[PDB]
Design a binder for this molecule. Structure first.
Ligand code: OI4
Ligand code: OI4
Lengths: 304, 304
């Protein structure tokens, strides 16, 4: 019992973190096999960031200009290439701590752990969701660029995020490990619209199931709803419309608790329309949307 | 910018986790140097737990009855001893992944990371506080016993908690690494009073400073208070009385923000008396007490 915003154990990712320096700029890199991946803005000065021509800036750099370090290990750079907004620095040594890994592009609404790093050193780990508007609400300061997001299935680390930027609004933006930004963002110092965000309905419902499993049940009611009725309420409250695919993903939680998905939707509808009335659910005074139905199943069953 | 419930990177602790089996019972152990530490109830059956005589139960066990495994590594047990509620199994091999470590007894109100484990395998990591009543509100299922809590300062892991039990109320209880329970708890299947808990005032104030640092300022007001006046409000709302030692620990945050500690106390007083009025602070709709002033300084400065 108990339900926490749990992150994946970060050890396999800690063994991949390196410091990458180019000129006056230092950030984090991810060393997998004989390649170090890092944000391409490592080649920029603060002045360059207003409107960088990355192709031109990278042409003035050679392999020896990229200093890659992992504590007492200095890596020898034998190749460099830019792929979208990431640099791939080929090194002469394969990382002996390379875990089994994959590079994945996660969907909005999915969750992942972030290993926040500074100067190639891990500072902390936290769980977060990729918002529907493709931003993340992380905890990042200058120097955290290159810190990565990931998920772990058994012995395989699926890297899904690399940190690049903080928007003027304080929210965060980054790329997949092929350097493609999530969202409309560009890697330049310009004000950029994140766009309207919404609450991840399927995740709030998964978290309400987690609440019932762990004993928080005060929000259960004698009502039911339909997908159409619930979606009129979701519209009013800036929630993502619920689809049958979402209902389908909630199947295991509905089966375990015996609470029909649309019955749980009626509870969510009443909480949206009336608020919490000064009460809490799983230690929260708001409707939590950073737990996917898969996260709930995993945490409630103790998967390792 | 951004502020998250961040846990320490768990890698150094993952390398210490082992599975300990004794008879029909399997739980987690912590392998440091040539000793494996685990809850002494590993020697009990479910029937034994109603009123176990641990000394008698342990007398029926020999070194070869404790099966210690770390994946493909089976450890050879050459000694066993009980220290309070923990067993210390001497093994013939020192853990090659032993980090620099210390065993510490944390104070109530302090925070730490928990690496939740099952069958010797890490499942997740989360940050939590030791409640003033010496319980923790974790996320633990059967088999998570032996999972540990810790803090990290540079390269040293200070182990402060080992998980033992879930109270009938769903909250958790455990020991320091010398096997002394935090709180009045005993390791037996009996209903046990946790006692009145309180909110960690100094931590809520530290978190209000973190909010101001990250741009959430709506709660700042034109008021001030005294320690005496604030403590009358703290009493009414089941908050820990604020002392000059607490004010002293908030000094760095007061200096950084320019907001006097008693001025921040007046903001906390108004939030206690009026609530949040449907607003949020750092993504929370309640007053968060799981961040110490040290946690705020560390996260806001990116310490690794
Ligand atoms: C300061 C900070 C904090 C948290 N995360 C990231 C940062 N850093 C940035 O955003 C840097 C500095 C500012 O200008 C830009 C512009 C574009 C890009 Cl891709 C990077 C950056
Ligand atoms: C089931 C569970 C869940 C989470 N954390 C822990 C547990 N396990 C327990 O509490 C076990 C089983 C029940 O009886 C007792 C009694 C005393 C002690 Cl020390 C241990 C236990």
């Amino acid at each position: 019992s108990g339900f926490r915003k749990m992150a994946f154990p970060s050890g396999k990712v800690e063994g991949c973190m390196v410091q990458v320096t180019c000129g006056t700029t230092t950030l984090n890199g991810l060393w997998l096999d004989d390649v170090v991946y890092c944000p391409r803005h490592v080649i920029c000065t603060s002045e360059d960031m207003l409107n960088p021509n990355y192709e031109d800036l990278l042409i003035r750099k050679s392999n020896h200009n990229f200093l890659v370090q992992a504590g007492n290990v200095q890596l020898r750079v034998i190749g460099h290439s830019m792929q979208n907004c990431v640099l791939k620095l080929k090194v002469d040594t394969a990382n002996p701590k390379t875990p089994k890994y994959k590079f994945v592009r996660i969907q909005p609404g999915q969750t992942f752990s972030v290993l926040a790093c500074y100067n190639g050193s891990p500072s902390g780990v936290y769980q977060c969701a990729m918002r529907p508007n493709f931003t993340i609400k992380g905890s990042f300061l200058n120097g955290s660029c290159g810190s990565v997001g990931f998920n772990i299935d058994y012995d395989c680390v699926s890297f899904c995020y690399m940190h690049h930027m903080e928007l003027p609004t304080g929210v965060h933006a980054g790329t997949d490990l092929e350097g493609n930004f999530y969202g409309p963002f560009v890697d330049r110092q310009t004000a950029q619209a994140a766009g309207t965000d919404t609450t991840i309905t399927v995740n709030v419902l998964a978290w309400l199931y987690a609440a019932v499993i762990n004993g928080d049940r005060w929000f259960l009611n004698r009502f039911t709803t339909t997908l159409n009725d619930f979606n009129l309420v979701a519209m009013k409250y800036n929630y993502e419309p619920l689809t049958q695919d979402h209902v389908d993903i909630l199947g295991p939680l509905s089966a375990q608790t015996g609470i029909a998905v649309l019955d749980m939707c009626a509870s969510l509808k009443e909480l949206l329309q009336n608020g919490m009335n000064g009460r809490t659910i799983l230690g929260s005074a708001l409707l939590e949307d950073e737990f996917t139905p898969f996260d709930v199943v995993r945490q409630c069953s103790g998967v390792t």
